[PDB]
C-alpha cells in the first residue's frame with residue numbers, strides 16, 4: 617500500500633513500439649542521457665557521436681572520471697548492431713537507487729539500424745547476465761557492478777504501461793504497482809532471462825503442441841523487444857487458432873504476418889471479438905504452474921497515429937523467431953514483472969496500469985497441476 621520506493625515510480629517513458637527508457641547520469645561533471653531498459657542484452661552502451669536520430673550523446677573528453685579501456689566492442693542484435701570503444705565512468709540513476717558506481721560503458725561511435733527516430737533514447741542498458749555480454753563474459757554488466765559495489769538488493773522490477781511511461785523499481789518491489797498476488801517462475805539459466813512455458817491456450821483452448829516446441833532453443837523475457845515472438849511451428853498454430861477464434865470479422869492474411877494494418881474509427885475497435893491468450897509458466901513447486909493471460913489490447917498495438925485522426929490503426933504484435941520464444945514489451949505491459957535475481961526467479965502480477973475493459977482483464981492465475989514440466993526445456 618505505502619511506498620518507500622515512491623521516488624522511483626514513473627521513472628520510465630516510452631512505449632512498446634519504440635522502447636521504454638530511464639534517465640542515467642554519467643561522468644563528471646554530470647551528463648544525463650535517456651537509456652533504453654533492455655532485459656534482452658547485457659551491455660551498457662551510449663551513443664557518443666552525433667547521429668540524425670539522437671538529440672544528445674556522451675562526450676567522453678568532458679568527463680574527468682572517464683577511463684578508456686583501449687579496446688573496441690561490436691554488438692549485433694536480432695535487430696541492429698553497433699560498434700564502440702570500451703571504458704568505465706561514474707554512473708548514477710537520478711530516479712533510481714541513491715548510489716553511484718563505476719561501470720563499464722561502451723561509447724557507440726558507429727551503428728546500423730539500431731537507434732530509432734523519435735524514440736527519444738540515446739543508449740541501452742543491458743540488464744541480462746554476463747554470459748551474453750560482448751566481447752565476452754569478463755565485461756561485468758551494469759547491474760552486477762551495482763550489486764557488488766553497493767548494498768542495493770539484487771533485484772529490480774518493471775511496470776511497463778501502454779496506451780505512456782512506466783516504473784523501474786531497483787532494489788525492491790513497490791506494492792502500489794500491482795494488485796493480487798505475485799507468481800514466480802524460475803530463471804532456468806543465467807544468461808538471458810530464460811523461462812519455461814509449459815502450456816498455451818487460446819480462449820481457453822489448449823494449442824495442444826508438445827511443450828518442447830514452446831521453448832525450442834529458449835524462451836526469454838525481453839523488455840527491449842516489442843512483440844511476442846514465437847518459433848515458426850508455434851507461430852503458425854497460434855495464428856490458426858486466433859483466426860478461428862476471431863471469425864466474426866475477416867482480416868487479410870497479411871495482417872497476421874505484420875504486412876498489413878487494420879484501422880477502426882476512433883473508439884470502435886471490437887476487442888470482444890478477439891481471443892485472450894494464456895501462457896502457462898513453470899512454477900516454484902514440483903508439478904505446479906500458473907498462467908498469465910494476455911488481452912487483444914496487448915497483442916494488437918497502435919501504430920503511431922497519423923495525426924489525431926478518426927482512425928486507430930493496429931499491427932499484429934505476434935511474430936516469428938528462429939531463436940526461440942521472446943516475451944516482449946506488449947506481453948509485459950499487462951503486468952508488474954519482478955526480476956528477482958537474488959532468488960533466480962521472475963514474478964508476474966496484474967499491473968496497476970493494466971489496460972483492460974468492462975468485459976475482460978489481464979490476469980495472473982494459479983496454481984495449476986502440470987506434470988513433466990522439466991521435459992519442456994531444450995538441452
Ligand SMILES: COCCN(C[C@H]1C[C@@H]1C)c1cc(-c2nnc([C@](C)(N)Cc3ccccc3)o2)c(Cl)c(N(C)S(C)(=O)=O)n1
Nearest residue numbers: 632633634635654656657693694695696840841842843935
Ligand atoms: C522499431 O523497431 C521495432 C521494435 N524493436 C525495437 C525495440 C525498442 C522497442 C521495444 C525491436 C527490437 C528487436 C530486438 N532485437 N534485439 C533486441 C534487444 C536485445 N532488445 C536490443 C535492441 C535492438 C534494437 C533496438 C532496441 C533494443 O531487440 C526485435 Cl527482434 C524486434 N522485432 C523484429 S519485433 C517487431 O519485436 O518482432 N523489434
